[PDB]
């Protein structure tokens, strides 16, 4: 009964299950390690059935729900033990949400047929304001300023949150109890996004002081700071490798960070409407890149404030493919509000034709790791699902889900079922306001809640 | 925490070894002794501590590396 014998037993049981499920076995065994090869190996875009998706909107009492993070246990092929923290949580799917109301809430999302079920929550307030007024003394257990982001540890043991109070509180998943507080130690070091390295305890935090901080949650320690962005680092995405990718908003640059190599690759759009119009013979100049998601260890996608969704490759500095005005144009302002004149024709002239029209922003953008399908979000009122080409040189619109109404601040996807037959559950946090600010005019019908859509595969 | 990274690794079977450059990130710490670096390098490379030799460490101006 040596440890070598125990692994052999578990490996033998695993093969027996694979025989029961079923060339096929050899192919399936390769797919167990396809993630180590950073390539797209999940081609299920054509098998998805968007039309028959079961939509549902769950209302929440929190105002301006800011981010959502989902935890899915995964079987470890090396040890054949599930990622669930305890035996009780075997095969339990969780989602964690944060809002500008300073509330962290965990939900149960195991049952795809049922709505999310609240389990526990933690709220902050004015009691947690530090008295010291020194940055290194900002070590209070709760939040006192807007929470902007949340991330669930891949081991199911910790959930970490951060926001405008310049702290990084790590909570226990079971009780939502704070176990460590890590100040960023900067006057303008507000945490804007968090990304865990897949199947690892390494965390990447993109802050407002133009820097990226990396932590080891198991050690509860900051490791390094990355420099190079010339404006706020708004979003950050990571995969199994140590190659996180970030976007810098107004500096209009995406950066890929090779952490072991201590180098970075800089990507820039460089589109100009005059040539775009000429080649055609409404095109909007990009102002800032707000969202990013890694399709692959070698590919990622970004969404800009002009509605452009671009596909990138590590080999090329410029985008390989772009989807302009992905979510359409904002409604034209009412002529009864543009001007105070009685004559309608005078008011119509103030609309200036179509010059005041501006595109929807890409507020959310999520790509399922190592697949060919990704989801975008805005406040248009629908979630659009896109499929990437087999050669990874383009993408097309797979479908839409119109249930969501409001600002899509964050998107997540969780799957269940056997290898052949997966049902995909899309969870999106919906707010009445943009996460970073209150600029967006109130959208008619927008509500604060959790948008849910269950998608099944047939063919 | 202290981070240790190895780069420019050359397998040199002529001298029966692996040669590399070692980067140590030690924020809020003066520096890392050669002995403890040898212990951690032995751990990561799965070798005896007696088989690891480290030298020529220069702290960067400003500290921390």
């Amino acid at each position: 009964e040596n440890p070598a014998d125990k692994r052999r037993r578990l490996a033998k049981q695993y093969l027996e299950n694979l025989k029961s499920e079923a060339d096929i076995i050899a192919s399936r065994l390769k797919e167990d390690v396809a993630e180590q090869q950073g390539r797209v190996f999940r081609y299920f875009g054509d098998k998805l059935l968007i039309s028959e998706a079961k939509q549902s909107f769950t209302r929440v009492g929190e105002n301006n729900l800011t981010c959502i993070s989902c935890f899915q246990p995964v079987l470890n092929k090396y040890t054949f033990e599930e990622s669930s923290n305890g035996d009780k949580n075997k095969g339990r799917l969780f989602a964690y949400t944060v809002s500008k109301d300073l509330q962290l809430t965990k939900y149960d999302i195991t049952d795809f047929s049922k709505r999310p079920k609240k389990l526990k929550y933690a709220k902050g307030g004015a009691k947690y304001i530090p008295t010291s007024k020194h940055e290194y003394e900002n070590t209070t257990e709760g939040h006192y300023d807007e929470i902007l982001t949340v991330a669930a540890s891949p081991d199911g043991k910790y959930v970490v949150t951060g926001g405008r109070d310049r702290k990084l509180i790590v909570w226990s998943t079971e009780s939502l109890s704070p176990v460590k507080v890590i100040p960023t130690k900067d006057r303008r070091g507000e945490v804007l996004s968090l990304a865990f390295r897949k199947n690892s305890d390494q965390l990447y935090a993109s802050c407002a002081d133009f820097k990226i901080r990396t932590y080891s949650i198991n050690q509860f320690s900051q490791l390094e700071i990355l420099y190079g962005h010339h404006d706020i680092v708004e979003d950050i995405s990571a995969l199994a490798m140590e190659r996180c990718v970030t976007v810098g908003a107004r500096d209009r640059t995406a950066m890929l960070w090779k952490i072991p190599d201590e180098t970075r690759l800089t990507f820039r759009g460089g589109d100009e409407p005059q040539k775009l119009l000429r080649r055609w013979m409404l095109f909007f100049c990009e102002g800032s890149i707000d969202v990013v998601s890694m399709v692959d260890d070698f590919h990622f996608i970004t969404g800009s404030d002009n509605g452009n969704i671009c596909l990138w490759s590590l080999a090329k500095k410029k985008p390989i493919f772009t989807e302009r005005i992905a979510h359409g144009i904002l409604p034209e302002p009412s002529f009864n509000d543009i001007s105070g004149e009685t004559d309608e024709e005078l008011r119509k002239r103030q609309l200036q034709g179509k010059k005041l029209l501006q595109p929807f922003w890409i507020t959310s953008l999520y790509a399922i790791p190592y697949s060919n399908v990704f989801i975008s979000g805005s406040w248009s009122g629908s979630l659009k699902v896109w499929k990437i080409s087999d050669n990874l040189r383009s993408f097309e619109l797979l479908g839409e889900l119109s249930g969501a109404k409001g600002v899509v601040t964050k998107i997540q996807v969780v799957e269940s079922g056997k290898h052949g037959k997966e049902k995909f559950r899309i969870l999106a946090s919906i707010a009445k306001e943009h996460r970073l600010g209150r600029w967006i005019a109130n959208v008619s019908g927008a509500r604060n809640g959790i948008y849910s859509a269950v998608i099944d595969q047939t063919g | 925490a202290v981070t240790i990274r190895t780069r420019k690794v050359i397998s040199n079977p002529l001298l029966a070894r692996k040669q590399f450059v070692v980067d140590v990130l030690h924020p809020n710490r003066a520096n890392v002794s050669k002995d403890e670096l040898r212990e951690k390098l032995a751990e990561v490379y799965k070798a005896e501590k007696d088989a690891v030799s480290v030298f020529g460490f220069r702290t960067q101006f400003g500290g921390g590396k």
Binding site: S216, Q219, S221, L223, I259, P260, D261 | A1, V2, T3, I4, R5, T6, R7, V9, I10, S11, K18, F20, K40, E43, V44, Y45
Partner: peptide, 28 residues
Amino acid sequence: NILSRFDPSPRAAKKRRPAAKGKNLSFK
């Protein structure tokens, strides 16, 4: 639009990828 010969003149060893890569670890 209409507007729109005889040339008289072993491979090297293929490059091998690095056998070893960098390793990283953190402690304390």
